[PDB]
Design a protein around this nucleic acid. Structure first.
Ligand code: NA
Ligand code: NA
Length: 327
DNA sequence: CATTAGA
DNA sequence: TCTAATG
């Protein structure tokens, strides 16, 4: 956690670099399990050889561990860090829509800058266009104060369209968070569940409304169950317009709301921990259900959930307010 | 680890 | 169809 920090951090740098600038999923996977194991290791790695004993660590990495242990750096790292091409890819990649694959390509063609990207908006698809368009806004955190106004809006319309709709803003925001990266609304309806052959308009009706009143202002991707746009707070009485925020909305079979809802509220750790718990308690939990475990090794049989509570009760735990779902 | 664009 | 990118 801090005993092996540099080593891991270096290893991760290396990893990430393989995967992105180069297409070396292997090396790239190497550096990762290595970085994974050395992390767990309960003592101070004092040399390569020591590390070397570790599963996942071989001659390659050890040698890096030495250089790094020896002199506070690493050449490859010093080289990579400096390297234009490499830096370029790491950056383009910042744009919503541009992955590594495309980042490599662009660069190859000579697009390395945001400006480059402009002059060639043409080479970019829709997504990427928006991403480039709101690059600044997209990189900004969402102040909870604002989250509150947005939630205020989304809920109201959802309702207006159909009062039968159940919407919940999930994420860190749900967990008390001072700021957030983007708004994630979870949604379901009664007439929509596990079996009931869909109802696409269900997602659509609402999306339509949001755009209708100008809350949603762009569409990165809209399908029958997941919508992925951009929204914005009505820039009040001039002088202060609001930044463009990422927003996602997902339809859910009512019969699998809360599990999902649980899930997305996080945190990543409370989850795991919640999940690990259910196991002892004779269960299993996943993004959609909670099935009683059977002794034969495994089992199925989706238990009936009406609220976050039921899930808890099942595993016989203490209802934990989102606020404290931090771990 | 699943859903969507795209080509 | 696959392969990318987000989450
Ligand atoms: Na080894
Ligand atoms: Na990106």
């Amino acid at each position: 956690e801090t005993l092996n920090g540099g080593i891991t951090d270096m290893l991760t740098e290396l990893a990430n670099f393989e995967k992105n600038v180069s297409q070396a999923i292997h090396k790239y996977n190497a550096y990762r399990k290595a970085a994974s194991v050395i992390a767990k290791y309960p003592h101070k790695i004092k040399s390569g050889a020591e590390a070397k004993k570790l599963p996942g660590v071989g001659t390659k990495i050890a040698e890096k561990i030495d250089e790094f242990l020896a002199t506070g750096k690493l050449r490859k790292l010093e080289k990579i860090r400096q390297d234009d091409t490499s830096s370029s890819i790491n950056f383009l990649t910042r744009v919503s829509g541009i992955g590594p694959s495309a980042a490599r390509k662009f660069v190859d063609e000579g697009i390395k800058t945001l400006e480059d990207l402009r002059k060639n908006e043409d080479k970019l698809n829709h997504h990427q266009r928006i991403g480039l368009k709101y690059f600044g806004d997209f990189e900004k955190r969402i102040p909870r104060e604002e989250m509150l106004q947005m939630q205020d809006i989304v809920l109201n319309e959802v309702k207006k369209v159909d009062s039968e709709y159940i919407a919940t803003v999930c994420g860190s925001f749900r967990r008390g968070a001072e700021s957030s990266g983007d708004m994630d609304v979870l949604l379901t309806h009664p007439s929509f569940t596990s079996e009931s052959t869909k109802q696409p308009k269900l997602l659509h009706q609402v999306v339509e409304q949001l755009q209708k009143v100008h809350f949603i202002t762009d569409t990165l991707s809209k399908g029958e169950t997941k919508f992925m746009g951009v929204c914005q707070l009505p820039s009040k009485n001039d002088e202060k317009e609001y930044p463009h925020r990422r927003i996602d909305i997902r339809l859910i079979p009512k019969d699998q709301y809360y599990c999902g809802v649980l899930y997305f509220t996080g945190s990543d750790i409370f989850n795991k921990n919640m999940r690990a718990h259910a196991l002892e308690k004779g269960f299993t939990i996943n993004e959609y259900t909670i099935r009683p475990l059977g002794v034969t090794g495994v089992a199925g049989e989706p238990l009936p959930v009406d609220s976050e509570k039921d899930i808890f009760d099942y595993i016989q735990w203490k209802y934990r307010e989102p606020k404290d779902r931090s771990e």
